[PDB]
Amino acid sequence: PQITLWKRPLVTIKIGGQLKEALLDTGADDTVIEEMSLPGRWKPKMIGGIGGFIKVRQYDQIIIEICGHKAIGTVLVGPTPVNIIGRNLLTQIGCTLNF
Amino acid sequence: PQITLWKRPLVTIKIGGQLKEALLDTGADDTVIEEMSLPGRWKPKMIGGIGGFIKVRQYDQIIIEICGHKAIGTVLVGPTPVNIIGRNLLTQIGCTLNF
Numbered sequence: 001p002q003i004t005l006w007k008r009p010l011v012t013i014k015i016g017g018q019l020k021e022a023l024l025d026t027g028a029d030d031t032v033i034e035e036m037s038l039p040g041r042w043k044p045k046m047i048g049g050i051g052g053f054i055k056v057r058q059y060d061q062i063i064i065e066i067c068g069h070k071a072i073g074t075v076l077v078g079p080t081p082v083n084i085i086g087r088n089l090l091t092q093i094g095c096t097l098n099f
Numbered sequence: 100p101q102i103t104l105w106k107r108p109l110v111t112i113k114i115g116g117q118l119k120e121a122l123l124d125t126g127a128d129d130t131v132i133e134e135m136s137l138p139g140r141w142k143p144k145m146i147g148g149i150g151g152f153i154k155v156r157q158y159d160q161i162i163i164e165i166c167g168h169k170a171i172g173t174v175l176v177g178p179t180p181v182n183i184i185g186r187n188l189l190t191q192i193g194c195t196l197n198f
C-alpha cells in the first residue's frame with residue numbers, strides 16, 4: 001500500500017495475541033507499545049525525546065503482524081502516549097519513504 | 100527519492116539560508132527545529148512527545164527546503180532532540196509511506 005500523511009499513519013497490529021492501533025513512525029528507532037504482557041526475559045531501558053525520557057521493558061524476538069506482514073524484533077513496553085511501530089520493524093515489512 | 104529505514108532518515112534542509120540536518124518523521128504531526136532566528140511574530144503551542152508535553156514557538160509561512168524540495172509552512176522552534184520534519188511539511192513535498 002501507499003499511505004499519505006494528511007493524517008497520522010495509524011494501522012492495526014497484532015501482538016501477543018492482542019489487536020492494537022499503532023503509528024507507523026519513521027522518527028522512532030524502536031517499537032514502543034503501551035503496557036501489556038509479553039513472553040520471555042526483559043531488561044529495563046530508557047527512551048526519550050521531546051518532553052524527556054520514560055522507562056520501558058525491552059523484550060526481544062517478538063512477533064508482530066502489521067498489515068498482513070509478519071515481522072520479528074525487539075519491542076519496548078511502557079507508558080507511551082501512543083503505540084509506535086519504529087524503524088526496527090518498519091524495515092522488515094519493506095516500508096520506505098518516497099517523494 | 101526512495102528512502103529505506105535501516106538508518107535514521109536524516110536529510111539536509113535549508114532554512115534562513117543555512118543548511119541543517121533533520122529527521123523525516125512520520126510520527127511527528129509538526130515540524131520542530133532547534134533554537135534559531137526566524138522572522139515575524141510567533142504564537143504559543145503545546146506539543147506532546149514521548150516523555151511529556153512542552154511549549155514551543157510557532158512561526159507560520161516559513162520558507163524551507165527539504166532534500167532540495169521547496170516548502171512553505173509552519174515551523175515550531177524549541178528544545179527538540181534533533182530537527183524534525185513532520186507531517187505538515189512531509190505532505191507538502193509529496194512524501195508517502197510505501198510497503
Ligand SMILES: NC(=O)c1ccc(S(=O)(=O)N(CCCc2ccccc2)[C@H]2CNC[C@@H]2NCc2ccc(C(F)(F)F)cc2)cc1
Binds near residue numbers: 125148
Ligand atoms: N508533535 C510533534 O511534532 C512531535 C511529537 C513527538 C516528538 S518526539 O517524541 O520527540 N519524537 C521524535 C523523537 C526522535 C528522536 C529522539 C531522540 C533522538 C533522535 C530522534 C517522536 C516522534 N516520532 C518519533 C518519536 N517517537 C517517540 C519515540 C522516542 C524514542 C524512541 C526510541 F528511542 F525507543 F527509539 C521511540 C519512539 C517530536 C515531535
Ligand SMILES: [Cl-]
Binds near residue numbers: 072073074088089
Ligand atoms: Cl529489533
Ligand SMILES: [Cl-]
Binds near residue numbers: 143154
Ligand atoms: Cl508562551
Ligand SMILES: [Cl-]
Binds near residue numbers: 171173187188
Ligand atoms: Cl504547515
